Design an enzyme around this catalytic site. Structure first.
Site, PDB file in Angstrom:
ATOM      1  N   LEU A   9       0.824  -1.197   0.000  1.00  0.00           N
ATOM      2  CA  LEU A   9       0.000   0.000   0.000  1.00  0.00           C
ATOM      3  C   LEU A   9       0.865   1.256   0.000  1.00  0.00           C
ATOM      4  CD1 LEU A   9      -2.891  -1.120   2.373  1.00  0.00           C
ATOM      5  CD2 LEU A   9      -2.601  -1.320  -0.123  1.00  0.00           C
ATOM      6  N   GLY A  10       1.985   1.197   0.713  1.00  0.00           N
ATOM      7  CA  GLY A  10       2.911   2.310   0.805  1.00  0.00           C
ATOM      8  C   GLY A  10       4.158   1.941   1.585  1.00  0.00           C
ATOM      9  N   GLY A  11       9.331   1.288   7.990  1.00  0.00           N
ATOM     10  CA  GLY A  11       8.772   0.063   7.447  1.00  0.00           C
ATOM     11  C   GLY A  11       7.865   0.286   6.253  1.00  0.00           C
ATOM     12  N   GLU A  12       6.825  -0.539   6.151  1.00  0.00           N
ATOM     13  CA  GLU A  12       5.873  -0.449   5.044  1.00  0.00           C
ATOM     14  C   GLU A  12       4.464  -0.826   5.487  1.00  0.00           C
ATOM     15  OE1 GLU A  12       6.484  -4.998   3.698  1.00  0.00           O
ATOM     16  OE2 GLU A  12       6.442  -3.501   2.089  1.00  0.00           O
ATOM     17  N   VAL A  13       3.521  -0.728   4.560  1.00  0.00           N
ATOM     18  CA  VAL A  13       2.134  -1.062   4.844  1.00  0.00           C
ATOM     19  C   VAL A  13       1.637  -1.981   3.741  1.00  0.00           C
ATOM     20  CG1 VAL A  13      -0.230  -0.188   5.006  1.00  0.00           C
ATOM     21  CG2 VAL A  13       1.630   1.012   6.184  1.00  0.00           C
ATOM     22  N   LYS A  28       0.653  -2.462   9.175  1.00  0.00           N
ATOM     23  CA  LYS A  28       1.781  -1.548   9.214  1.00  0.00           C
ATOM     24  C   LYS A  28       2.935  -2.223   9.928  1.00  0.00           C
ATOM     25  CE  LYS A  28       2.838   3.317  10.449  1.00  0.00           C
ATOM     26  NZ  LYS A  28       2.190   4.514  11.080  1.00  0.00           N
ATOM     27  N   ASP A 113       0.390  16.295  11.854  1.00  0.00           N
ATOM     28  CA  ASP A 113       0.913  16.183  10.475  1.00  0.00           C
ATOM     29  C   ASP A 113      -0.189  16.013   9.492  1.00  0.00           C
ATOM     30  OD1 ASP A 113       3.442  14.150   8.740  1.00  0.00           O
ATOM     31  OD2 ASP A 113       2.945  16.272   8.544  1.00  0.00           O
TER      32      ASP A 113
END
Ligand SMILES: CCCC[C@H](Sc1nc2ccccc2c(=O)n1-c1cccc(Cl)c1)C(=O)N1CCC[C@]2(CCCNC2)C1
Length: 253
Positions: A9-10, A11-13, A28, A113
């Site tokens: 989807l996008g 450490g990482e996810v 996540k 953020d």
């Protein structure tokens, strides 16, 4: 039962899908090799405009957060560069953003953020505030604590954060929501950062609204933006008052 990691989807996810139910969840992976506060803060959250937290799992060194999967993607991807999006859509996303922010501030949490990469969309295009890695408690036992830590993303950050040693948490999240509204309505960020050395920011303080991105924005929402993007955080509009603003309450289709 059992989950499959179908894609990044996008450490990482990664996107996890139940082998039986075909239900999905974002996982996540936090290589602890933020996180503690992020899990802690996430445990307190439950609101329709905040990414749902299912639970976590350490399992060695890789921390695993189980979060609501938002199939609609990032709001960031709904903004056409240089254009924005239709005003009615921007208003609905802005209403939902305020609903999530009111909730967070109500329980004494600041996100710190807010930006379109962190505002995800579900299947019905409902906005969800995402990523509590930078979030903190600004109110506890009914006593407010002023913040001092530099957190955020320059184009979206409030000017006080660059100029003051201590500042109130809430007007900072209000400001970032105003930059998000600008990006939705103009497909453009108004300045690299809110400092007097930044020409675009100086032009805004001198009311040069005939320049971009302001010229692409209708007068009603621009009036709201004039109340939000006010340098002095004590004079800046508060969320309850944004909710009473003329454009916020304008019927749009
Ligand atoms: C008009 C088309 C340009 C649009 C770009 S959009 C943009 N710029 C960024 C600049 C810095 C960091 C992040 C971004 C970013 O996420 N977007 C971005 C891209 C797509 C979607 C979204 Cl939400 C953000 C822009 O606003 N600027 C880059 C060019 C110069 C600026 C200087 C300040 C005055 N406006 C123009 C800033």
């Amino acid at each position: 039962e059992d989950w499959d990691l179908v894609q990044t989807l996008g450490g990482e996810v990664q996107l996890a899908v139940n082998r039986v139910t075909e239900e999905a969840v974002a996982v996540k992976i936090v290589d602890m090799k933020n996180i503690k506060k992020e899990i802690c803060i996430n445990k307190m959250l439950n609101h329709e405009n905040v990414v749902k937290f299912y639970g976590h799992r350490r399992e060695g060194n890789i921390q695993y957060l189980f979060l609501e999967y938002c199939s609609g993607g990032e709001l960031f991807d709904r903004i056409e560069p240089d254009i924005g999006m239709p005003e009615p859509d921007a208003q609905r996303f802005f209403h939902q953003l305020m609903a999530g922010v009111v909730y967070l501030h109500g329980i004494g949490i600041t996100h710190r953020d807010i930006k379109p990469e962190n505002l995800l969309l579900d299947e019905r295009d409902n906005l969800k505030i995402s990523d509590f890695g930078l979030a903190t408690v600004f109110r506890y036992n009914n006593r407010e604590r002023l913040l001092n830590k530099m957190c955020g993303t320059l184009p979206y950050v409030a000017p006080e954060l660059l100029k003051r040693r201590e500042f109130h948490a809430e007007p900072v999240d209000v400001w970032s929501c105003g930059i998000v509204l600008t990006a939705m309505l103009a497909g453009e960020l108004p300045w690299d950062q809110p400092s007097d050395s930044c020409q675009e920011y100086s032009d805004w303080k001198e009311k040069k609204t005939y320049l971009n991105p302001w010229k692409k924005i209708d007068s009603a929402p621009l009036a709201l933006l004039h109340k939000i993007l006010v340098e002095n955080p004590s004079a800046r509009i508060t969320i309850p008052d944004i909710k009473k603003d003329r454009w916020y309450n304008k019927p749009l289709k």
